[PDB]
Amino acid sequence: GSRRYDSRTTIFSPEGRLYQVEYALESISHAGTAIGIMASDGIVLAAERKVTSTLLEQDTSTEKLYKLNDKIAVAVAGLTADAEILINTARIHAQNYLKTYNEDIPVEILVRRLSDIKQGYTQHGGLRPFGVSFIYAGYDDRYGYQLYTSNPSGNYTGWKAISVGANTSAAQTLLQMDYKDDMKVDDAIELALKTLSKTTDSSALTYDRLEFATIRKGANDGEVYQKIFKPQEIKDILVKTGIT
Amino acid sequence: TGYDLSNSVFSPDGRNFQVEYAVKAVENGTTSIGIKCNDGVVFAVEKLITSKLLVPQKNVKIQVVDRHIGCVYSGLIPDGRHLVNRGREEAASFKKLYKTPIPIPAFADRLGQYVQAHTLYNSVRPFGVSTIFGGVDKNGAHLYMLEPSGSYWGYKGAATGKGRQSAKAELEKLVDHHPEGLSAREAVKQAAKIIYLAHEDNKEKDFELEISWCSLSETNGLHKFVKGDLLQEAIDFAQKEIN
């Protein structure tokens, strides 16, 4: 019968590893680098677009950075199509929580549920896992500003600063060097860009090959604002830090 | 390669090797025939007497569908029974909805589509039988032969099993020598002869003859078994011809 053609996606290796999860991570390591940095007064999300063409429409484009609700955003690394499936699920889960409790969903709860979905694809169903790694950047009134990451294994962890995708080894070393706890948002913006500028496989880092976003309490009095940077705004912030 | 390991897989020729392998099982089985006649059809089959311990006349192989259709087959006997069980369900639902008994061509396609369906998936095995069947309906007499692939045609005479070539040759002579037609009672006698002649290809064990028939005049359009005096008369006719 059909047994002949089954890849058996949800099994262990003799070493005790999940083949498909390991290979999905190998896929993600070729995707454009995404960096998250958490400051005391906000969070920065920076991401490098995958080898851009000059005729690509840049302003009306969304590849790396997505909005989950008003308080939470994600940076993507891997298959975009796979990520969008998970993003719409996450968006729905957030609205279910709000409908049930009349309160915005705590960041970790959203992250756990999305990570639990990925876990399921590694243990049962016989389907391939989602070839996606997220950086979650969000705020709630319990823990304040929070950075998380999840990967195809369904395992998630919290971070002060973190990178996913390509050159994470080199990127993580640079972040570990210059990061400190009393850091401000504007400093974190500069660190994020400087790190990408050194770890990039491109010749020079330009505005058209970047997506950028901040989550500050920079609105008026005790409330959070999400800023998905426009092309011209990335151009200005790149000049202001002296990269171009 | 490996194209022959799974059912429903096309080979580079455009062939389904699993179906061709099922045909080999049919070729291995005992001989069975079908003869179309003036106003009906006649069926006959070779029953190998494996042992003295087999009860004569009590291992019946020819099967009836509805009250007007006869079915006989060569190959895997259980597979044939499964096909007839389906045939009986198909014929029952036709009569249920449309009142009239199922026509033979209509019935032929019902089996055809069912057998063909068992060549579409790797989760099922093709049928290991060629089935000779037919009967009498509103449009007269019809004889059919169905194969593992789902392929079937109408026939003047039909044969399958280990002695199919011997039987086919003998059938072709009847078609040539009787262009105007063969009678029902004649066809019963000829059927006996052809089974006896086809037994030469399976002559280690001696055998038991079994005949059935549908005829508008002789059996009133219904399927019946040939027994008693009419059976012995046909056996004697066959015995006289081999010598």
Binding site: - | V23, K24, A25, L53, K58, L76, H82, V124, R125
Partner: protein, 231 residues
């Protein structure tokens, strides 16, 4: 070789190897004999034990007051099939107030075994059965094989070294068929038949298993001291 992975696959010569391997399980099983006259039908079964401390595996099963079988091969498969026969015999009684014909019993077993040989996932039954019974057309004996093939016989035997008993019955055919109105003599012929399949071992009191059905005799099984008469 490459065509014995499952039952859904034919070999290049048109063979079903999984069905043939199931047939092989019967040959490993202990011998059992069946024979009938015109008035009665008898089952004789050599039971097998694990060792001297163990009991002897029961070979004969009752299906109705007028029908029952003996098994050879996988016993759990015989339990599944005998249970199905019990239900079918019972359906015939409750719905139609009619004792199930022994011939129809065979037809039903054939069709049940067949479905397992044409579908992916499942497997063939790994047991052979000898069904005896007395119905409206007198005494009957059937031989079931898990290929689906069912055969009505005067006498037969299945299991290891069954060829010895089968040859004896083939010689004795004319004698035992006319043992009418005499249960003990028909059993004696069956006990003598199964004896032709014995090697090194002989028939003891907790080794032999006999069953009988007939004109004025319900299907009843004899074990223990009740079979001491026939040794």
């Amino acid at each position: 070789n490459n065509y014995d992975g499952d039952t859904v696959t034919f070999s290049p010569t048109g063979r079903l190897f999984q069905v043939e391997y199931a047939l092989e399980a019967i040959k490993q099983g202990s011998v059992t004999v069946g024979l009938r006259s015109n008035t009665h039908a008898v089952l004789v079964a050599l039971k097998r034990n694990a060792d001297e401390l163990s009991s002897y595996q029961k070979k004969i099963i009752k299906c109705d007051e007028h029908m029952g079988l003996s098994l050879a091969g996988l016993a759990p498969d015989a339990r599944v099939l005998s249970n199905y026969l019990r239900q079918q015999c019972n359906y015939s009684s409750l719905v139609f107030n009619r004792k199930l014909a022994v011939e129809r019993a065979g037809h039903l077993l054939c069709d049940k075994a067949q479905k397992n040989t044409q579908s992916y996932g499942g497997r063939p039954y790994g047991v052979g059965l000898l069904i005896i019974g007395y119905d409206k057309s007198g005494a009957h004996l059937l031989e079931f094989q898990p290929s689906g093939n069912v055969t009505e016989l005067y006498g037969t035997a299945i299991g290891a070294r069954s060829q010895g008993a089968k040859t004896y019955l083939e010689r004795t055919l004319d004698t035992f068929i006319k043992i009418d109105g005499n249960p003990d003599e028909l059993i004696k012929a069956g006990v003598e038949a199964i004896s032709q399949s014995l090697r090194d071992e002989s028939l003891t009191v907790d080794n032999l298993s006999i069953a009988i059905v007939g004109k004025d005799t319900p299907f009843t099984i004899y074990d223990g001291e009740a079979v001491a008469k026939y040794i």
